[PDB]
């Protein structure tokens, strides 16, 4: 059954039917056992494709909305805003879905440093995606929940993973984006990203055969952000 679900998740991924990949991997998560690296990754890809489709839609519609505000077409504005809201409803439902799977199933069953950091960082990512479109109280609560999860992931990562580890780097990259895009803090975003990058450069001997390409790519992204932000 667990192997069958993995197989079905992999078929859905090949067919680019990410909804189905999510349903298959959600059933694996629901077994209340430690996921393998492969399963963790399948689950995370599934949801990142599902949410990423709506985030890309959201950003297109919001830009359209911004163009129309500049020309004051209010009939158009009406429909664009109603359409945005609908996509926001979907983003909320999807984030709420994985955040429940994380809280119910994933985080309670996680018993390795690596998996705990991966799931807390995921929790940080999904609150952060809530925060991207949230205003008012919702934005504050999403930002606080994201911050808490990313600090929790950081606490474990600092003690349990080498600074070159791809999940630790991935956490640094996304938490720096969080400080930049949600907390509006370019200075803290830059420090976190720069620290993560310097700490890995200091310990390049910790680079693993399994993930040196993954580490190198994240370190290049940390650098691309720092470029973008300074």
């Amino acid at each position: 059954d667990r192997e069958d679900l993995v197989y079905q998740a992999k078929l859905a991924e090949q067919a680019e039917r990410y909804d189905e990949m999510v349903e298959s991997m959600k059933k694996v998560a629901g077994m209340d056992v430690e996921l393998t690296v492969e399963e963790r990754n399948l689950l995370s890809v599934a949801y990142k494709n599902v949410i990423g489709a709506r985030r890309a839609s959201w950003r297109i519609i919001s830009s359209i909305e911004q163009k129309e505000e500049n020309k004051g077409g209010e009939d158009k504005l009406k429909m664009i805003r109603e359409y945005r809201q609908m996509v926001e409803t979907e983003l909320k439902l999807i984030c709420c879905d994985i955040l429940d799977v994380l809280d119910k199933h994933l985080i309670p069953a996680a018993n390795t440093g690596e998996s705990k950091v991966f799931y807390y960082k995921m929790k940080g990512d999904y609150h952060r995606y809530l925060a991207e479109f949230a205003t008012g109280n919702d934005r504050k609560e999403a930002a606080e929940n994201s911050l808490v999860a990313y600090k929790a992931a950081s606490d474990i990562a600092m003690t349990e993973l080498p600074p070159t580890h791809p999940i630790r780097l991935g956490l640094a990259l996304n938490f720096s984006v969080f400080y930049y895009e949600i907390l509006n803090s370019p200075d803290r975003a830059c420090r976190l990203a720069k620290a993560a990058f310097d700490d890995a450069i200091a310990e390049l001997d910790t680079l693993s055969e399994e993930s040196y390409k993954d580490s190198t790519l994240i370190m290049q992204l940390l650098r691309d952000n720092l470029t973008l932000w300074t």
Partner: peptide, 7 residues
């Protein structure tokens, strides 16, 4: 527009 971890 910042880069986050790819997938």
């Amino acid at each position: 527009r910042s880069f986050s971890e790819p997938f």
